[PDB]
Amino acid sequence: SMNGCDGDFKTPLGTVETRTMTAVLSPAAATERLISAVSELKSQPPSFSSGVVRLQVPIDQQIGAIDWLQAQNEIQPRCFFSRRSDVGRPDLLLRNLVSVAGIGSAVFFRDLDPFSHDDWRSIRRFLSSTSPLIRAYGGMRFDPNGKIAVEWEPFGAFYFSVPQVEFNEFGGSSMLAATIAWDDELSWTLENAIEALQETMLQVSSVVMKLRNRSLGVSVLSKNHVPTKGAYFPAVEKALEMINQKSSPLNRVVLARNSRIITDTDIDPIAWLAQLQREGHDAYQFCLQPPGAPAFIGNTPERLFQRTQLGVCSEALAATRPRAASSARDMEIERDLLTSPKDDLEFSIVRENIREKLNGICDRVVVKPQKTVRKLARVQHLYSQLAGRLTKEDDEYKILAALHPTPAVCGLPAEEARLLIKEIESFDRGMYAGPIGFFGGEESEFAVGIRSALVEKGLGALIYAGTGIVAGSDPSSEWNELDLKISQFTKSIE
Ligand SMILES: C=C(O[C@@H]1C=C(C(=O)O)C=C[C@H]1O)C(=O)O
Numbered sequence: 306s307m308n309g310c311d312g313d314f315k316t317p318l319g320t321v322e323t324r325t326m327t328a329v330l331s332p333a334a335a336t337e338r339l340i341s342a343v344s345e346l347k348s349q350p351p352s353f354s355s356g357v358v359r360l361q362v363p364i365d366q367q368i369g370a371i372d373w374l375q376a377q378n379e380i381q382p383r384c385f386f387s388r389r390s391d392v393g394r395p396d397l398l399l400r401n402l403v404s405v406a407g408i409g410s411a412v413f414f415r416d417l418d419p420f421s422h423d424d425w426r427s428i429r430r431f432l433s434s435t436s437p438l439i440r441a442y443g444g445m446r447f448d449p450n451g452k453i454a455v456e457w458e459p460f461g462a463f464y465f466s467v468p469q470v471e472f473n474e475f476g477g478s479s480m481l482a483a484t485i486a487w488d489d490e491l492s493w494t495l496e497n498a499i500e501a502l503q504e505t506m507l508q509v510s511s512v513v514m515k516l517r518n519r520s521l522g523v524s525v526l527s528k529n530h531v532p533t534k535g536a537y538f539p540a541v542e543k544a545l546e547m548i549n550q551k552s553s554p555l556n557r558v559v560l561a562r563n564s565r566i567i568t569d570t571d572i573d574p575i576a577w578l579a580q581l582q583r584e585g586h587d588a589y590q591f592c593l594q595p596p597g598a599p600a601f602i603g604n605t606p607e608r609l610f611q612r613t614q615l616g617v618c619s620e621a622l623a624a625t626r627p628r629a630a631s632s633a634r635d636m637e638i639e640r641d642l643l644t645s646p647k648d649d650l651e652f653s654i655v656r657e658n659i660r661e662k663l664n665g666i667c668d669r670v671v672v673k674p675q676k677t678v679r680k681l682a683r684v685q686h687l688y689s690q691l692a693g694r695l696t697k698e699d700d701e702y703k704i705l706a707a708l709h710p711t712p713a714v715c716g717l718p719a720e721e722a723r724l725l726i727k728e729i730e731s732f733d734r735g736m737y738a739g740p741i742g743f744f745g746g747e748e749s750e751f752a753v754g755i756r757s758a759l760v761e762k763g764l765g766a767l768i769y770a771g772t773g774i775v776a777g778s779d780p781s782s783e784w785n786e787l788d789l790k791i792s793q794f795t796k797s798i799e
């Protein structure tokens with residue numbers, strides 16, 4: 306492929322364009338027609354020294370993108386993204402993509418230095434408002450200045466990629482697409498790109514089985530935590546005095562745990578993700594797997610931001626109490642959350658901090674509601690949606706730079722929290738609690754990379770979770786909460 310960060314981001318490409326083929330009925334037909342479209346393009350090519358050409362075949366059937374991805378060979382990077390069902394909740398910004406899978410890279414974007422405005426421009430060079438589905442999938446480290454552990458090395462400080470071949474799932478139809486990207490200045494010519502693409506296309510599988518199985522077929526040989534429970538309690542104790550004494554301004558710090566599971570045979574991360582998706586309501590599903598890397602997957606409720614043209618939306622998601630088995634206990638826990646003066650104050654400093662980030666960029670911000678409880682499968686959180694209008698679409702980078710990270714995954718004051726995390730946590734968060742999603746021309750959307758796992762062949766998996774330590778947090782209670790948060794992974798692996 307080619308690293309678009311190496312490109313001349315101030316010089317526009319020769320073209321960025323989408324070509325739609327006649328619709329077919331099945332994925333096997335789509336794969337054959339797409340092979341033919343790439344061939345025809347090779348024989349009647351564009352002649353620019355740089356460009357992006359997306360060729361897409363509509364499929365009349367509704368096919369799950371994760372089922373298509375499951376059928377594919379290990380052609381990396383592997384991408385997956387499915388936005389939230391957003392059931393019943395208002396869309397404050399007042400054909401839609403249900404899921405997308407990608408294999409290979411038409412162009413990728415990676416650096417060891419933090420994602421910068423120039424990097425954002427480098428990606429924007431490959432997108433266009435008139436090609437809405439040309440999108441770059443990936444994310445950014447929680448802390449792009451932290452020490453990178455080896456398991457996170459392939460991800461860099463950030464990793465994005467336009468798929469070589471992708472499957473788009475819509476409400477009542479689907480689409481197979483392939484993307485040709487090239488830049489002679491980077492010694493990745495149109496002929497290089499077409500040749501790489503034609504090899505991948507002959508490897509694409511149309512045996513798209515509809516998956517059902519609950520058994521992943523792996524035995525867990527051990528489970529250990531970093532930190533262990535014996536190291537965690539003192540760490541939370543240390544944070545709690547910093548908060549309650551008047552030497553440290555700390556009011557909130559999110560402290561995380563890496564739960565390591567060793568398996569005999571390799572976990573299939575796409576199969577695992579597929580099982581979280583059928584059981585995951587109102588959540589983002591994602592996979593990011595750079596070449597030669599473990600697969601970063603997640604099923605997260607939390608939006609960092611969504612942008613549609615000039616409208617930007619984010620949310621404040623903080624505090625955690627468990628769900629209860631009985632209806633009366635569940636409601637009592639919920640009312641406790643909604644009425645506690647302490648929780649109100651702790652949630653407010655999160656909501657108001659995010660509100661003002663948006664307020665610094667948008668003319669005016671809407672907050673709705675001020676405070677409710679968002680109920681998930683095993684936990685429930687306090688919650689608030691915040692939306693604002695950009696003056697210009699190019700302010701997208703400002704949104705991203707202002708919001709990541711919010712106090713929901715880092716803390717307050719940000720400076721003192723971020724450095725306590727650096728000193729207390731002995732593992733690399735990597736892209737856990739980092740932005741994960743995609744850039745597009747007129748639309749971009751990023752989840753917060755929580756409720757996620759790193760899945761490594763020949764090893765097993767790292768399962769991540771954190772909790773907000775605030776005045777009055779109970780170490781035993783928070784430890785139990787970390788177990789509840791990773792429970793969607795630990796149950797389904799069995
Ligand atoms: C840190 C994440 O949880 C986050 C921290 C919130 C809290 O303060 O409890 C709850 C929702 C998330 O924003 C995680 O689940 O790993």
Ligand SMILES: [Mg+2]
Nearest residue numbers: 772773774778
């Ligand atoms: Mg807490």
